[PDB]
Design an enzyme around this catalytic site. Structure first.
Site, PDB file in Angstrom:
ATOM      1  N   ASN A   1      -1.763  28.250  22.296  1.00 21.12           N
ATOM      2  CA  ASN A   1      -0.558  28.894  21.791  1.00 21.12           C
ATOM      3  C   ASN A   1      -0.933  29.791  20.592  1.00 21.12           C
ATOM      4  OD1 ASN A   1       2.184  29.496  21.530  1.00 21.12           O
ATOM      5  ND2 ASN A   1       2.816  27.467  20.846  1.00 21.12           N
ATOM      6  N   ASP A  16      -2.844  40.543  39.001  1.00 18.88           N
ATOM      7  CA  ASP A  16      -1.739  39.598  39.004  1.00 18.88           C
ATOM      8  C   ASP A  16      -2.096  38.485  39.975  1.00 18.88           C
ATOM      9  OD1 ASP A  16      -0.058  40.834  37.150  1.00 18.88           O
ATOM     10  OD2 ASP A  16       0.729  42.208  38.624  1.00 18.88           O
ATOM     11  N   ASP A  56      12.673  31.220  34.464  1.00 20.71           N
ATOM     12  CA  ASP A  56      13.087  31.862  33.223  1.00 20.71           C
ATOM     13  C   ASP A  56      12.045  31.693  32.122  1.00 20.71           C
ATOM     14  OD1 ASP A  56      16.384  30.556  33.925  1.00 20.71           O
ATOM     15  OD2 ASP A  56      15.551  32.515  34.512  1.00 20.71           O
ATOM     16  N   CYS A  95       4.166  37.197  20.951  1.00 23.60           N
ATOM     17  CA  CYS A  95       3.372  36.225  21.696  1.00 23.60           C
ATOM     18  C   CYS A  95       2.619  36.905  22.829  1.00 23.60           C
ATOM     19  CB  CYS A  95       4.282  35.131  22.261  1.00 23.60           C
ATOM     20  SG  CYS A  95       5.670  35.801  23.264  1.00 23.60           S
ATOM     21  N   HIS A 106      12.662  25.139  24.606  1.00 23.66           N
ATOM     22  CA  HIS A 106      13.189  23.786  24.402  1.00 23.66           C
ATOM     23  C   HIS A 106      12.718  23.181  23.092  1.00 23.66           C
ATOM     24  CE1 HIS A 106      13.525  24.422  28.774  1.00 23.66           C
ATOM     25  NE2 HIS A 106      14.681  23.810  28.581  1.00 23.66           N
TER      26      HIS A 106
HETATM   27  C1  LIG Z   1       7.203  35.296  22.534  1.00 25.48           C
HETATM   28  O1  LIG Z   1       7.725  34.124  23.151  1.00 25.48           O
HETATM   29  C2  LIG Z   1       7.155  35.070  21.038  1.00 25.48           C
HETATM   30  O2  LIG Z   1       6.656  35.925  20.319  1.00 25.48           O
HETATM   31  N1  LIG Z   1       7.641  33.900  20.610  1.00 25.48           N
HETATM   32  C3  LIG Z   1       7.781  33.548  19.201  1.00 25.48           C
HETATM   33  C4  LIG Z   1       9.006  34.195  18.596  1.00 25.48           C
HETATM   34  C5  LIG Z   1      10.230  34.130  19.251  1.00 25.48           C
HETATM   35  C6  LIG Z   1      11.330  34.824  18.765  1.00 25.48           C
HETATM   36  C7  LIG Z   1      11.218  35.587  17.619  1.00 25.48           C
HETATM   37  C8  LIG Z   1      10.006  35.656  16.959  1.00 25.48           C
HETATM   38  C9  LIG Z   1       8.907  34.963  17.444  1.00 25.48           C
HETATM   39  C10 LIG Z   1       8.236  36.398  22.825  1.00 25.48           C
HETATM   40  C11 LIG Z   1       9.565  36.123  22.112  1.00 25.48           C
HETATM   41  C12 LIG Z   1      10.701  37.107  22.466  1.00 25.48           C
HETATM   42  C13 LIG Z   1      10.679  38.526  21.863  1.00 25.48           C
HETATM   43  C14 LIG Z   1      11.596  38.447  20.662  1.00 25.48           C
HETATM   44  N2  LIG Z   1      12.445  37.299  20.962  1.00 25.48           N
HETATM   45  C15 LIG Z   1      12.062  36.596  22.029  1.00 25.48           C
HETATM   46  O3  LIG Z   1      12.689  35.683  22.560  1.00 25.48           O
HETATM   47  N3  LIG Z   1       8.456  36.451  24.262  1.00 25.48           N
HETATM   48  C16 LIG Z   1       8.335  37.564  24.985  1.00 25.48           C
HETATM   49  O4  LIG Z   1       8.046  38.664  24.514  1.00 25.48           O
HETATM   50  C17 LIG Z   1       8.494  37.378  26.482  1.00 25.48           C
HETATM   51  C18 LIG Z   1       7.115  37.569  27.125  1.00 25.48           C
HETATM   52  C19 LIG Z   1       7.092  37.463  28.645  1.00 25.48           C
HETATM   53  C20 LIG Z   1       5.892  36.858  29.304  1.00 25.48           C
HETATM   54  C21 LIG Z   1       7.192  36.123  29.308  1.00 25.48           C
HETATM   55  N4  LIG Z   1       9.515  38.315  26.969  1.00 25.48           N
HETATM   56  C22 LIG Z   1       9.174  39.639  27.153  1.00 25.48           C
HETATM   57  C23 LIG Z   1      10.059  40.533  27.658  1.00 25.48           C
HETATM   58  C24 LIG Z   1      11.382  40.109  28.004  1.00 25.48           C
HETATM   59  C25 LIG Z   1      11.745  38.801  27.823  1.00 25.48           C
HETATM   60  N5  LIG Z   1      13.009  38.205  28.043  1.00 25.48           N
HETATM   61  C26 LIG Z   1      14.200  38.772  28.437  1.00 25.48           C
HETATM   62  O5  LIG Z   1      14.361  39.937  28.733  1.00 25.48           O
HETATM   63  O6  LIG Z   1      15.147  37.808  28.438  1.00 25.48           O
HETATM   64  C27 LIG Z   1      16.570  38.118  28.728  1.00 25.48           C
HETATM   65  C28 LIG Z   1      17.283  36.790  28.865  1.00 25.48           C
HETATM   66  C29 LIG Z   1      16.653  38.919  30.010  1.00 25.48           C
HETATM   67  C30 LIG Z   1      17.102  38.898  27.544  1.00 25.48           C
HETATM   68  C31 LIG Z   1      10.776  37.826  27.270  1.00 25.48           C
HETATM   69  O7  LIG Z   1      11.100  36.658  27.033  1.00 25.48           O
END
Ligand SMILES: *[C@@](O)(C(=O)NCc1ccccc1)[C@H](C[C@@H]1CCNC1=O)NC(=O)[C@H](CC1CC1)n1cccc(NC(=O)OC(C)(C)C)c1=O
Ligand SMILES: *[C@@](O)(C(=O)NCc1ccccc1)[C@H](C[C@@H]1CCNC1=O)NC(=O)[C@H](CC1CC1)n1cccc(NC(=O)OC(C)(C)C)c1=O
Ligand SMILES: *[C@@](O)(C(=O)NCc1ccccc1)[C@H](C[C@@H]1CCNC1=O)NC(=O)[C@H](CC1CC1)n1cccc(NC(=O)OC(C)(C)C)c1=O
Ligand SMILES: *[C@@](O)(C(=O)NCc1ccccc1)[C@H](C[C@@H]1CCNC1=O)NC(=O)[C@H](CC1CC1)n1cccc(NC(=O)OC(C)(C)C)c1=O
Lengths: 220, 216, 220, 220
Positions: A187, A114, A160, A25, A140
């Site tokens: 999206n 930023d 979060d 994403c 959600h």
């Molecule tokens: C993005 O939301 C996405 O591609 N969503 C669709 C999707 C979800 C899961 C699997 C396949 C497709 C992406 C989803 C992430 C990566 C793989 N699994 C996920 O949950 N979100 C991110 O990459 C997100 C982007 C940032 C701007 C907000 N993201 C990046 C880096 C770290 C985190 N989270 C993280 O470290 O969370 C903890 C709780 C600390 C592990 C993150 O969400």
């Protein structure tokens, strides 16, 4: 700022794309913002390659289908001196080795900005810059099943965020005095999700879902 | 069998429920099917307790929010001698120790019937028995995003079902025939929580491969 | 009174019906209210014949597919001494001569009650009686395309109601504008309209669309 | 969520107050929730004026010592642009004309969140938001006479509530016991009532006394 903004009507926004079952994403958010800024600079809208970011932007901190950050994507484009077009480097929804070819680069940037972490600053950036990469708490059931109206999730967090998307405008529904305001958000789940792949997100409710917590755009 | 069937019109079906973030679809499919057969037997429609199944049917092979099978749930009601009402034992979307109270049982069964794995057999069952528990392949984003129309997913496997739901009827376009299927994802999903699944299209999403109902 | 009510959960409500291209919404509102009161009395939910009302309640003031009032329908059932089941006298969506047959009557009433024209009185009636017949202003494009959320139409009149429907409960959900309360309303445009055929109409917003202005139920 | 929560140990909760013989429980529940969200946002606990709400929030639906709702109080603070401190606008236990002075405002909000009508939803909100306003059925002499222990009243309604209070936590009988979990509830009847002015109300027993039926908190 203007009372409402919709950058799609100005030529800044490509059609909705579909990231598939890959955690990319962040790459779709990043290409959306760079598409907007390249159009702002050149007057030509050219769809950009998410696959190029998935495969190539590890050195800047991204992890392909396991997640990434839009700012790291903008840093890759700066370091690399380019980004290939969607047409030249199509999306495969899985991480592979880097095949960037500078002859098919159609974008560049000089870094990124930023935005301060509040919705008045975000509105000013949307109104004066173009579409803005943001992170939201999309974690959600209500978000999966969103159909129409202004999305408001009581359990949404402003800390979060987990999902990168693109603010392409904002506005209001009903009577202006009702303060029924939204962000217009693109999206990357295809056009069958949501409202043609778009969601109206609650606006001016103290940073609902964290939409103003990690907002940025590339400098071109 | 009739050209179309909708057991909701005959009083067999409770409102759509929401399983939430707990892997308990199997329990909602089971209560759905038992609600229908109990109404068929008694003329009374009483919503039944998924939580009772989640908390209590471990000995039959179920694993709570980690998954389970409708037949194991029907086996539990037989073994246990009853099942509490939804109102007496409401849904918590998380697994806890068993709180079954026989004084609040409103349903029983004497076993279950697995239907032969063909859509013609499923159709006869729907037509003559009532709502039927079935397993479908729901592991595609098109199913998550479904809102209206006749669902068909190219990538749907007729052999890797992962989701229990309830067939409450079937119908026709006028052949894009369909099964009328109650889900457990709340009213905001699909068509008020229902989905029309492609009927008679090579057992689409495996709908007829694991169909069953409780013996009341 | 309770903060949430839903008579569908108590067995009082038949599935959504479809009046087709006949102005018989008043008849569907009436049958829904009588279906609820008959269930309250006997414990048996029996779908009732709108066609019986369309064809037969002219002497009480109804005009078939050209319109009618729920109160006239309740008066008909009283005057007539009965009303046929849906299964015995099915819906044709066109006005025909009266084919009422008392042998197939499954419902009766002894008149009706008109509710004072305040949303608080509608609330107490919904809370204590069961589903209530009401008239609303449905003449707006937003009403046709409704899919989810709380319906609010700024141009909605509280004096020009044109559409009979059925309040089966009320509730709340968090929203952008913090106008969070709704009436749960069964329509007669089939399951494809709105949310399974239902709409959440704005509640406690100055009698939005007139929903409390023509509320009544049959006396069973 | 954690197995037990007590926001008093984090600094979110003012001492127990005494509403006296005025029907202002809604104003105490509201200031309690806003005290908690202001602390969450600013790191300062400042006791807020129930009198300000009693005298001034009629325009939002409140009726002073004759009753009111926490959500209307949260709406007032938004409409008014502020709320005075307890110290600046002390409690008199009777309705008077409004004496709000913006120079003494110490709290603000941008609306409110109504939590869905599930105890699991209330549990998540208490764990992640802070203290939560709730309505409960307190209309039993057992509640008047409560002193210690886990409160359970066989005649308690889960639908018809009459008293606004404040959930500040929740707890358990023992780590591995589904039995006798409780909500930790701050009342406004002074510290002589109940357990220093607190009551442990039965948790996860079919939404006992309706505690999860009308829970909300202000947006800050
Ligand atoms: C993005 O939301 C996405 O591609 N969503 C669709 C999707 C979800 C899961 C699997 C396949 C497709 C992406 C989803 C992430 C990566 C793989 N699994 C996920 O949950 N979100 C991110 O990459 C997100 C982007 C940032 C701007 C907000 N993201 C990046 C880096 C770290 C985190 N989270 C993280 O470290 O969370 C903890 C709780 C600390 C592990 C993150 O969400
Ligand atoms: C059910 O489909 C469900 O609750 N869906 C919504 C949901 C999904 C995930 C998390 C929370 C809610 C349920 C989903 C399972 C349990 C948790 N994760 C899942 O994928 N499906 C089943 O329980 C299902 C029921 C049978 C009738 C079709 N089911 C039962 C037992 C085993 C499996 N799968 C399995 O063993 O898969 C492998 C990967 C082979 C181990 C199963 O799907
Ligand atoms: C009802 O809303 C309905 O069946 N709507 C769907 C539909 C509309 C048009 C044609 C076919 C289906 C029904 C619609 C009426 C009758 C046909 N044309 C309409 O607009 N509404 C009523 O019957 C309604 C019921 C009362 C409770 C609100 N109704 C009854 C009697 C008179 C009027 N209107 C009226 O006289 O309007 C003027 C402007 C004076 C002509 C009325 O709406
Ligand atoms: C609150 O419980 C309170 O101040 N209690 C102490 C007290 C009781 C009586 C008199 C003086 C002090 C408050 C009590 C009300 C106001 C005065 N009479 C009362 O019984 N309760 C409410 O204000 C309560 C708050 C909502 C969250 C639950 N509340 C608000 C609005 C309406 C009603 N009730 C109502 O309409 O009741 C019926 C009988 C259905 C009309 C209500 O209790």
């Amino acid at each position: 700022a203007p009372r409402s903004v919709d950058w799609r009507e100005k030529g800044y926004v490509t059609p909705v794309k579909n990231q598939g079952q890959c955690g990319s994403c962040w790459a779709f958010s990043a290409t959306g913002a760079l598409e907007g800024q390249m159009f702002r600079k050149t007057g030509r809208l050219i769809s950009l390659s998410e696959q190029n970011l998935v495969d190539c932007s590890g050195p800047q901190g991204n992890e392909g289908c396991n997640g990434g950050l839009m700012d790291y994507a903008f840093q890759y484009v700066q370091d690399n001196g380019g980004l290939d077009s969607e047409e030249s480097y199509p999306y495969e929804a899985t991480e592979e080795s880097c095949k960037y070819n500078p002859k098919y680069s159609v974008a560049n940037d000089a870094g990124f900005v930023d935005i301060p972490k509040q919705e008045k600053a975000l509105m000013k950036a949307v109104a004066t810059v173009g579409p803005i990469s943001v992170a939201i708490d999309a974690g959600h059931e209500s978000f999966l099943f969103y159909k129409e109206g202004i999305y408001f999730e009581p359990d949404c967090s402003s800390e979060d965020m987990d999902h990168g998307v693109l603010v392409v405008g904002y506005g209001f529904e009903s009577t202006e005095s009702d303060n029924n305001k939204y962000w217009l958000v693109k999206n990357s789940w295809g056009e069958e999700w949501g409202m043609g792949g778009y969601v109206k997100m609650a606006k001016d409710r103290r940073n609902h879902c964290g939409i103003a917590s990690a907002a940025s755009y590339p400098t071109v």
